[PDB]
Amino acid sequence: DGVGSSSGNWHCDSTWLGDRVITTSTRTWALPTYNNHLYKQISNGTSGGATNDNTYFGYSTPWGYFDFNRFHCHFSPRDWQRLINNNWGFRPKRLSFKLFNIQVKEVTQNEGTKTIANNLTSTIQVFTDSEYQLPYVLGSAHQGCLPPFPADVFMIPQYGYLTLNNGSQAVGRSSFYCLEYFPSQMLRTGNNFQFTYTFEDVPFHSSYAHSQSLDRLMNPLIDQYLYYLSRTQTTGGTANTQTLGFSQGGPNTMANQAKNWLPGPCYRQQRVSTTTGQNNNSNFAWTAGTKYHLNGRNSLANPGIAMATHKDDEERFFPSNGILIFGKQNAARDNADYSDVMLTSEEEIKTTNPVATEEYGIVADNLQQQNTAPQIGTVNSQGALPGMVWQNRDVYLQGPIWAKIPHTDGNFHPSPLMGGFGLKHPPPQILIKNTPVPADPPTTFNQSKLNSFITQYSTGQVSVEIEWELQKENSKRWNPEIQYTSNYYKSTSVDFAVNTEGVYSEPRPIGTRYLTRNL
């Protein structure tokens, strides 16, 4: 451990072992100085043009954190093609972490001449929060991941958190967390940092699509032995009376047959079309949205429960706020055009789940009599019933991996609505910060705190290794499957590759459910 000797290597490799796969990825980072080393109250109120639905209260800290909670940090696009073609599922088991080659630099600005020189004595402060005593920011799909392409250099985000509020004011039950109250390890150049984490048990991910549906689980050749009500009014003519008639279900009346299972839950949303001439001519993005009400606020049900996107031959329809939407390379932040975003599709789960843009079913409404016509009622929102089945939302190449289950008394089927894995004890947050170095103090005493600092920033590498567990394919199916493939004809540039200017780019969101399985 000296100045003139490096303290690491470059490990970026993926190995396959039958039922395991170990992926390692290495990047290079740089950390600036946040808030000029100060804690700051930040808030938003109901004054101005703002509404009550968008207010907050919180604090902002000089610490920066690491986010690798997204699948493209670990999987090269060939390895994503090896994964989804040959397996019925996967879950992770354990991971590791390693920071090394810390360099700390200082900058000086004198009359346009900006000089950068080494600093060999300054430190950085890194610690992990294992016992979960902080707010958990990860798993909320923010920016700042490791880059998809290994040759790129990225910038570390900033750590800030929210508390309770009443408008732009706090309450008595609010909290303030000072991040210099936790034990941390200080590293000069020539040091390093590492730890090792172990996942708990979790269900496998369902990386398959059923080849069969709930309404078609019967034998097409044998009648049933169990009747139903088939006729109430006679058919002799116009002199009809009331009667009772019964029949057996068979091959020609397969909608009337008795069934054992129910489709999944429904929470209906509004339908919009990709052809702009077929929609209503008003701004209905928020007024017609699907919302859930929570303490005088209307939060957007995004992306809602796991429901199918569109039925057969209707690829142009999609729910307004019920799917994941991914932006292309160099898309605008506000008011991006339709040709600049990528819409995903969850048509694989229509074998069990209802379509998000249609109702669940039809129930009875009153008590029919001799002088009373019977009435029906359309169910738009249905909770759980005994005997339902459903499928969770699919995972993607650039979607998130995990999410922390909130510590409450009760929860029901704790899978994340953005897809991925549900964990009670997630991977811990890692917080990094430059230790301050003062400027020249006065010669006489002063009890004020020092506010004149030397401007610094740091850099180095990072290494993440995650081991996955697999489940192999074991089907007896005769005809060929469906595989993810490339395009055969020529193009201007190769997909999943660099530009002629050096810009990496992803053409399309890749799903996971391509193989088949019977119900």
219: burial class by Cβ within 10 Å (0-12, 13-18, 19+)? exposed
Q: 227 vs 2, 219, 224, 262, CA distance in Å?
A: 85, 16, 8, 20
Distance CA 97, CA 259 (A): 51
DSSP helix/strand/coil, 169: strand
Q: Which is nearer to its own copies, 39 or 182 (CB)?
A: 182
User: Which of 178, 221, 239, 255 is close enough to bind its own copies by CB under 8 A?
Assistant: 178
How far apart are alpha carbons 129 and 182 in whole angstroms?
9
Q: Which stretch binds its own copies (CB under 8 A): 183-191, 196-204, 340-348, 404-412?
A: 183-191
Residue 46 beta carbon to its own copies: minimum distance, rounded to whole angstroms: 51
174 touching its own copies, by CB under 8 A: yes
* In contact, 421 and 199? CB cutoff 8 Å: no
b/e burial code for range 57-74 (CB count within 10 A of at least 16 → b): bbbbbbbbbbbbbbbbbb
Find tokens 């116009």 and name the residue.
238
> Would you say 399 and 419 are in contact if contact means Cβ atoms under 8 Å apart?
yes
500 binds its own copies (CB under 8 A): no
For CA atoms 331, 334, 338, 343, give the dihedral sign: positive
Measured between alpha carbons, how far is 474 from 88 in angstroms, rounded to an integer? Answer: 9
How far apart are alpha carbons 175 and 178 in whole angstroms?
10
Site residues for its own copies, window 37-96 (CB under 8 A)?
76
Question: Shortest approach of its own copies to residue 488 CB, angstroms?
Answer: 4
On the 0-12 / 13-18 / 19+ scale of CB atoms within 10 A, 393 is buried
Residue 437 CB, shortest distance to its own copies, in Å, is 25
Q: Does 239 bind its own copies (CB under 8 A)?
A: no
Q: Give the residue with the Cβ less far from its own copies, 105 or 425.
A: 105
Under DSSP, the state recorded for 52 is: G
Q: Is 13 in the site for its own copies (CB under 8 A)?
A: yes
DSSP state of 208: -
Instruction: Single out the residue of 140, 169, 240, 499 in contact with its own copies (rule: CB under 8 A).
Output: 169
The verdict on whether residue 339 carries a ligand-binding annotation is no
Binding string to its own copies for residues 135 to 154, with x set by CB under 8 A, is what? Answer: --------------xxx---
Pairing of strands 227-233, 242-248: antiparallel
Bridge partner list, 421: 402
> How near is the Cβ of 465 to its own copies at its closest, in Å?
13
Going through 191-329 in order, the beta strands assigned E by DSSP cover 193-198, 209-210, 227-233, 242-248, 266-267, 271-273, 291-293, 298-300, 317-319, 325-327
166 touching its own copies, by CB under 8 A = yes
Q: Which is nearer to its own copies, 160 or 289 (CB)?
A: 160
* By the rule CB under 8 A, 191 interacts with its own copies: yes
Query: Which residue's CB is nearer to its own copies, number 112 or number 172?
Result: 172
Q: How many residues lie near its own copies (CB under 8 A)?
A: 43
Window 195-214: residues binding its own copies (CB under 8 A): none
Among 87, 189, 357, 458, binds its own copies (CB under 8 A): 189
Report, in Å, the least distance between residue 284 CB and its own copies.
Answer: 43
| Contacts with its own copies, 471-490, as mask; x by CB under 8 A | ---------------xxxxx
Nearest-approach distance from CB 431 to its own copies, in angstroms: 26
Per CB under 8 A, the list member of 155, 186, 254, 331 interacting with its own copies is 186
The structure tokens 């506000």 sit at 334
Would the annotation count 58 as a binding residue?
no
22 interacts with its own copies by CB under 8 A: no
- Considering the complex, state which of residue 33 and residue 76 has its C-beta at the smaller distance from its own copies: 76
Closest separation in Å from C-beta 400 to its own copies? 25
Closest CB to its own copies among residues 186, 288: 186
Residue identified by tokens 């001519």 is 281
> Does the protein bind its own copies through residue 36 (CB under 8 A)?
no
Burial readout 341-369 (b: 16 or more C-beta within 10 A, e: otherwise): ebebebbbbbbbbbbbbeebeeeeeeeee
In 3D space, the residue among 16, 84, 17, 19 whose CA is nearest the CA of residue 472 turns out to be 19
Among 276, 447, 491, 500, binds its own copies (CB under 8 A): 491
Please state the closest distance from residue 151 (CB atom) to its own copies, in A.
Answer: 5
Binding residues for AMP: 415, 422
Question: Residues within the annotated binding site?
Answer: 415, 422
- The binding site for its own copies (CB under 8 A) comprises 4-6, 8-13, 76, 149-151, 166, 169-172, 174, 176, 178, 180-181, 183-191, 486-494, 497-498
